[PDB]
């Protein structure tokens, strides 16, 4: 149903850390888009701290005039959802875009694998 993706975004975005963490399978992973070129793997016991830190910085970004915008998930496998996102200014200038790949099993997130397009130089 992909309802767990909506649950994850609603809770994480509102700072309801505990609900957001519980959207993940006990063996699930959230892999960040950076991590020295390899991505940083966070297991379920590390995801609460990641959400807290990311929300703190989203707050700073918003105050700086930039925020993220997420599209509704495009479902492929019934078990796979692609959430496209942008970072953009108030007047809609897109400065970064990327994707969240969600792999689901049994109503829980087994993988959230995040990628961004790269700014070089």
Ligand X SMILES: CCC[C@H]1C(=O)CC(=O)O[C@@H]1CC(=O)/C(C)=C/C[C@@H]1O[C@](C)(CCO)C[C@@H]1C
> Beta strands 24-31 and 108-116: pairing type?
parallel
Residue 99 near which of a copy of itself, ligand X, none (CB within 5-8 Å, type-dependent): a copy of itself
Are 101 and 80 contacting, i.e. CB atoms less than 8 angstroms apart?
yes
Q: What x-and-dash track marks residues 41-60 binding ligand X by CB under 6 A?
A: ----------x-xxx-xx--
Which is nearer to a copy of itself, 19 or 32 (by Cβ)? Answer: 32
Residue 61 near which of ligand X, a copy of itself, none (CB within 5-8 Å, type-dependent): ligand X
Strands (E), 16-79: 24-31, 41-43, 66-70, 74-75
- Where along the sequence are the contacts to a copy of itself (CB under 8 A)? 33-39, 76-77, 79-80, 82, 94-99, 101, 113, 115-120
Q: How far is the CB of 27 from a copy of itself (least distance, A)?
A: 18
DSSP 2: -
Tell me the C-alpha distance between 103 and 90, whole Å: 31
Residue 10: CB atoms within 10 Å: 13
Binding residues vs ligand X (CB under 6 A): 9, 12-13, 51, 53-55, 57-58, 61, 67-68, 87
């Amino acid at each position: 149903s992909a309802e767990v993706i909506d649950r994850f975004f609603k809770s994480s975005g509102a700072g309801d850390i505990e609900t957001a963490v519980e959207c993940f399978a006990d063996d699930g992973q959230w892999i960040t888009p950076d991590g020295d070129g390899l991505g940083t793997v966070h297991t379920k016991d590390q995801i609460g701290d990641l959400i807290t830190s990311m929300n703190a910085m989203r707050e700073k970004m918003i105050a700086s005039g930039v925020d993220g915008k997420f599209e509704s998930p495009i479902m492929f496998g019934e078990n796979m959802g692609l959430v496209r996102w942008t970072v953009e200014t108030d007047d809609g200038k897109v400065v970064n875009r990327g994707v969240d790949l969600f792999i689901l099993s049994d109503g829980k997130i087994v993988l959230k694998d995040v990628y961004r397009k790269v700014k070089l130089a």
